[PDB]
C-alpha cells in the first residue's frame, strides 16, 4: 500500500494505490483503499486490510449515529479522536495506518493516525510500504495554496512513485477530492500500468474436463 493526502486551498486530496496483496500475490488489482467516513471526511487505510476496514467502518458508523444526535456535519477532529482512542486501546495490535482527510467548518483537515494511536495533523502526508517514495515526490513539489488540478496531479505523481518503486503498491491511482461542499472519488484517475500483450484465449471446448458424476437442480 501507499496512500497520500495533500491540503490544497479549497480542501483536501487523498490518493491510494489499489493492489491488495496476500503475501507475495495480488489478490485484487482494483481494490478501493479510500473509504467513506462521512460526507465531508474520507479515510485512506494502509496496514492490515481487515483492521483498516473494521476501524474505519466502526467510526464512520459512530460518526453517522452522532451526526443524527447533533444535526451537524461530523468534524474531522471528532473522527480523528475516535480512531486515536480506538487504536491506542489496542497498543497497535490493530495495525491500521490511516490518512484521515476531510473539510469541516474550521477548514481543510488532514491527519495521519499511525497504528499505535500517534496523530500528525499536517499539510501533506503518506502511509504504507510506498510512503517513503511518495513523501519524496510530495516534499519536492508541494507548495501552499495549490489548485485542485495541481493537487490531484501531485498526489497521482506521489502514488505513482510508491506504485513503481515499491512492490506492495501497484496498478492504478484512486484520488479523492474533499472540498467544503462535496466529495469527488475518481477511481482510476491515472492507469499507468495498462495491458502489455493481449490475452491469448486458450479454447477448452465443453466436455473437455472428464466428469464422473453430475446433478442438475432447476429453480
Amino acid at each position: 500500500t501507499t496512500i497520500v493526502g495533500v491540503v490544497y486551498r479549497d480542501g483536501v486530496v487523498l490518493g491510494a494505490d489499489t493492489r491488495a496483496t496476500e503475501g507475495s500475490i495480488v489478490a485484487d488489482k482494483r481494490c478501493r483503499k479510500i473509504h467513506y467516513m462521512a460526507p465531508n471526511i474520507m479515510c485512506c487505510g494502509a496496514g492490515t486490510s481487515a483492521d483498516t476496514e473494521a476501524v474505519t467502518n466502526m467510526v464512520s458508523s459512530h460518526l453517522a449515529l452522532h451526526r443524527l444526535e447533533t444535526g451537524k456535519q461530523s468534524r474531522v477532529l471528532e473522527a480523528l479522536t475516535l480512531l486515536k482512542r480506538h487504536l491506542y486501546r489496542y497498543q497497535g495490535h490493530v495495525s491500521a495506518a490511516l490518512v484521515l482527510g476531510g473539510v469541516d467548518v474550521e477548514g481543510p483537515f488532514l491527519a495521519t493516525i499511525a497504528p499505535h494511536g500517534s496523530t500528525d495533523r499536517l499539510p501533506f502526508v503518506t502511509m504504507g510500504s510506498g510512503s517513503i517514495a511518495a513523501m519524496a515526490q510530495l516534499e519536492a513539489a508541494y507548495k501552499d495554496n495549490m489548485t485542485c488540478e495541481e493537487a490531484k496531479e501531485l498526489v497521482a505523481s506521489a502514488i505513482r512513485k510508491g506504485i513503481f518503486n515499491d512492490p506492495y503498491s501497484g496498478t492504478q491511482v484512486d484520488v479523492c477530492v474533499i472540498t467544503k461542499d462535496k466529495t469527488e472519488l475518481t477511481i482510476g484517475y491515472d492507469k499507468p500500468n495498462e495491458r502489455m500483450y493481449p490475452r491469448q484465449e486458450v479454447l477448452l471446448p465443453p466436455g473437455t474436463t472428464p466428469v464422473l458424476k453430475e446433478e442438475i437442480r432447476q429453480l
Binding site: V7, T119, D120, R121, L122, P123, F124, I132, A133, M135, A136, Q137, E139, A140, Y142, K143, D144, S157, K161, F164, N165
Partner: protein, 218 residues
C-alpha cells in the same frame, strides 16, 4: 562511524555523484566535515554508505592496486569498468570470509565518452544503471531520479541532472535522520572527476500547516 546516503545520475557525457559530508557514530552526528567521495585513479570516483572504516580499507586497497598496476608495468590505467570489477570481487571475497566490507558503494567514472555508474552491496550484489542510490537515497531520492530519466528519455543535461540531485538532496535532508545540509558533488566528465566545494541547499520550513496552532495536539 557510518556514512549517510549517496545518489548518482548519468547525464550527457558524464556522471554526478552526491553525498552528505557526515559520518555518524550511531544516532550522534560525529563529524560534519568528512569528504566521503574519494577519487580512484585518474578516471573514477567511489563513495559509500555504511562503515567508513570498511570503506576506508576497501578504497585504500583499490587506489593502491590501480596506481601500482599503472606505475610498475608500462600499461594504460584500468578503465572504470575494470576498477569497479576489482572493487566488486574484493567485496564478494570479504563476504565469503564472513569478514564483510559492510558498506554499499556507489561508483562513477568516465574513460572517453564511455560513461560508467554502478552500485555494489556488502555481499557483492553489483548493478550498473543510469541512476544509483544507497542508504535512504534508494527509498527517497531514486524514485525522483528515475522520474527525471523517464521524462528526459534522450538523456539529462548537466544543469538538469544538477537540479534533480539538489531536489533529492533537499528531500534526503528533510527525511533521512543521519544527514546534514552540506553535500559534495563528484562530476565525472571526459577530462576526469571533479569534486565540488561543499554546498548547502535552500530548504522551505514555513508552510502554513507547519505553524504551531495547526500542529498542536490540543
Amino acid at each position: 562511524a557510518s556514512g549517510g546516503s549517496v545518489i548518482a545520475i548519468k547525464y550527457k557525457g558524464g556522471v554526478l555523484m552526491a553525498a552528505d559530508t557526515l559520518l555518524s557514530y550511531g544516532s550522534l552526528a560525529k563529524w560534519p566535515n568528512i569528504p566521503r567521495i574519494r577519487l580512484l585513479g585518474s578516471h573514477s570516483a567511489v563513495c559509500a554508505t555504511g562503515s567508513y572504516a570498511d570503506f576506508q580499507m576497501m578504497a585504500k586497497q583499490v587506489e593502491d592496486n590501480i596506481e601500482r598496476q599503472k606505475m610498475y608495468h608500462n600499461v594504460d590505467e584500468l578503465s572504470p569498468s575494470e576498477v569497479f570489477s576489482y572493487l566488486h570481487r574484493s567485496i564478494y571475497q570479504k563476504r565469503c570470509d564472513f569478514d564483510p566490507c559492510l558498506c554499499q558503494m556507489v561508483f562513477i567514472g568516465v574513460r572517453d565518452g564511455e560513461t560508467f555508474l554502478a552500485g555494489v552491496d556488502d555481499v557483492g550484489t553489483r548493478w550498473e544503471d543510469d541512476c544509483i542510490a544507497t542508504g535512504y537515497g534508494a527509498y527517497i531520492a531514486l524514485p525522483l531520479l528515475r522520474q527525471a530519466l523517464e521524462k528526459n528519455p534522450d538523456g539529462l543535461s548537466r544543469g538538469e541532472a544538477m537540479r534533480i540531485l539538489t531536489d533529492c538532496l533537499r528531500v534526503l535532508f528533510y527525511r533521512e535522520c543521519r544527514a546534514i545540509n552540506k553535500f559534495q558533488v563528484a562530476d565525472a566528465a571526459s577530462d576526469g572527476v571533479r569534486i565540488s566545494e561543499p554546498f548547502d541547499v535552500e530548504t522551505h520550513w514555513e508552510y502554513e500547516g507547519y505553524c504551531f496552532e495547526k500542529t498542536a495536539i490540543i
